[PDB]
Design a protein around this ligand. Structure first.
Ligand SMILES: O=C(CCC1CCCC1)Nc1cccc(N2CCCCC2)c1
Ligand SMILES: O=C(CCC1CCCC1)Nc1cccc(N2CCCCC2)c1
Lengths: 193, 193
């Protein structure tokens, strides 16, 4: 039950590593999961719903990892506080590149995939702006741009730049340099007058 | 000749304002341009080639406007030097939102559209890194990140953030705030130690 479902999810994650969702058939996922095609349609309405579920799991893993950090302050300077938080996203999506890639590609065709990405980006932006404001209240950061606008651009930058690096797009920051690049731009833009 | 071609281009730009390329037919473009369908196939092999041509024109207009700025230094401080340069892209693509949107969407299906966007981003990144390096040689900017990595992230940020704002995506920086938001992040990340 729960286990035929996980088999179909693990198969789809596996196959997405080698080819696009468009090149993967329901029969492929059924055969990989060791079930028939009509049995597959019992657990999922379509191969699109499988990707939605995979994406939902990755996004909620990032989200829960960030909540965990937010509840327990790492004991360290501000540059490292940001680095640790951006790193949740670098490690989480970077450990699931195929789902991240197919999930981003599906934004163009799936309203539920577009709304999932949008809900969670709104959450992460609101958290980012809340930390910047806490920093300006403390007198640790200057009052420059509106915190929510700054947070929005920084989060969009990370979405686009992490994604280019994970894809090895041309152009992209190499994956082994992208964290340091992003933390530099977040710290100078949040703390710089 | 040149004029039946321009008619088909202007029609396609017009129709893209109201609907996606997928909802636009060759007959639509022919009727709008006042020609028959086989005559259309004389000037363009497909509606996809029409979008490629539209995108190529927008991208080269930005590119030529930036070259023009680069050849004639605006007489002003550094914050304003960056603002004027980012503004070429904000005004150029922002005056052609429908083509920008369809052109970005076509990256997923067209190799020639993906290569056009990639060639020009590489050029603009190399120019951005060359100006940062000139600034560090002058002693006006500190030697922090590798200039080409910093340029890459800043350009990716602009591509993603300008585009969200032009689309009115949720989330996005409002279009009337996006320039100021971007110039802040470029100046603090280039000049901040
Ligand atoms: O990376 C960030 C910044 C998060 C903040 C850092 C500390 C507090 C929150 N935000 C973000 C938001 C939406 C999507 C994405 N990506 C989606 C495609 C794969 C790469 C990451 C990242
Ligand atoms: O906006 C920039 C920064 C350019 C630098 C600013 C001064 C020197 C060059 N770069 C850039 C690169 C590729 C695509 C895009 N966009 C593509 C989608 C619509 C919005 C803009 C922008």
């Amino acid at each position: 039950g729960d286990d035929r479902e996980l088999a179909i999810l693990a198969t789809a994650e596996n196959l997405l590593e080698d080819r696009p969702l468009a090149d993967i058939s329901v029969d492929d996922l059924a055969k990989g999961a060791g079930i028939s095609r009509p049995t597959f349609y019992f657990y999922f309405p379509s191969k699109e719903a499988v990707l939605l579920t995979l994406l939902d799991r990755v996004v909620n893993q990032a989200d829960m990892a960030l909540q965990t950090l937010a509840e327990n302050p790492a004991d360290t300077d501000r540059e490292n506080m940001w680095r640790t938080g951006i790193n949740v996203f670098f490690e989480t999506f970077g450990s699931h590149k195929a789902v991240t890639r197919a999930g981003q590609a599906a934004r163009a065709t799936s309203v539920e995939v577009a709304e999932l990405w949008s809900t969670f980006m709104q959450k992460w932006i609101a958290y980012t702006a809340a930390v910047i404001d806490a920093e300006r209240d403390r007198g640790a950061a200057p009052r420059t741009l509106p915190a929510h606008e700054l947070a929005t651009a920084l989060n969009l930058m990370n979405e686009r730049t992490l994604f280019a690096s994970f894809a090895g797009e041309q152009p992209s920051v190499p994956e082994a340099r992208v964290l340091d690049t992003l933390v530099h731009i977040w710290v100078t833009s949040i703390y710089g007058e």
